């Protein structure tokens, strides 16, 4: 589909903005590399560190194809402690329609409004979430059907950025305290965002 390209693009920049902001609000990186920026008419924090920015973009460019052929279920930004085990998880459940309309009009400016709300919620999450333990790092998990990864092969080699199966310990969460943030729905995208904290 051609309208899938645009939903994969739009969704991709959103995820990048979200990731940059989640890294900010959860003190995963030194406050100083983050710069004030503005997307969806809202103030955000984008990083100015070369490699970090390239790491996040290389990650999203690999998801882009999975997003097109509606192969993404959950895109998760996981925060780990020195024990190298999950402390927090920002789950973005995703599902697009079986097919996308060829009557490509500006119902997208409607998506921007919906997206805008996720950004704002993420910006306040540090109010309902205690401070994480020092020295945490992040990773990105992506939930798909083992067969749709075929769409990823070519681009992994392109961006020279390989992926691999996740080990159930690398994902495992204790309990955990589910904290819902936002849930949107629409002609092209139904998305939900919630946080998983540990005890």
């Amino acid at each position: 589909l051609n309208s899938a390209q645009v939903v994969a693009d739009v969704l991709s920049e959103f995820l990048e903005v979200a990731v940059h902001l989640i890294l900010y609000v959860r003190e995963v990186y030194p406050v100083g590399i983050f710069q004030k920026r503005k997307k969806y008419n809202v103030p955000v924090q984008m990083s100015c560190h070369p490699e970090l920015n390239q790491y996040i973009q290389d990650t999203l460019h690999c998801v882009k194809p999975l997003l097109e052929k509606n192969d993404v279920e959950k895109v998760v930004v996981v925060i780990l402690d020195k024990e190298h085990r999950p402390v927090e998880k920002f789950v973005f459940e995703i599902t697009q329609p079986p097919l996308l309309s060829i009557n490509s009009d500006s119902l997208l400016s409607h998506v921007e409004q919906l997206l805008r709300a996720f950004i704002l919620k993420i910006s306040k999450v540090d109010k309902v979430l205690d401070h994480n333990p020092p020295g945490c790092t992040f990773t990105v998990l992506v939930h798909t059907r083992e067969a749709a990864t075929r769409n990823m092969e070519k681009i992994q080699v392109i961006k020279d950025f390989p992926w691999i199966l996740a080990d159930e310990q690398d994902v495992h969460m204790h309990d955990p305290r589910l904290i819902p943030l936002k849930t949107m729905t629409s002609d092209i995208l139904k998305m939900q965002l919630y946080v998983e904290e540990r005890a």
């Binding site: 590399i33 970090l52 990650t59 790092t137 998990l141 992506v142 939930h143 990864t149 992926w163």
Partner: peptide
């Protein structure tokens, strides 16, 4: 065919590398 969780082989730059980068103005 069935459910799977995937992630990048490469690890994000360590908070330590970033600090050195920052302190160097």
């Amino acid at each position: 065919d069935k459910k799977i969780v995937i992630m990048p082989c490469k690890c994000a730059p360590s908070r330590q590398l970033v600090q050195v980068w920052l302190q160097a103005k």
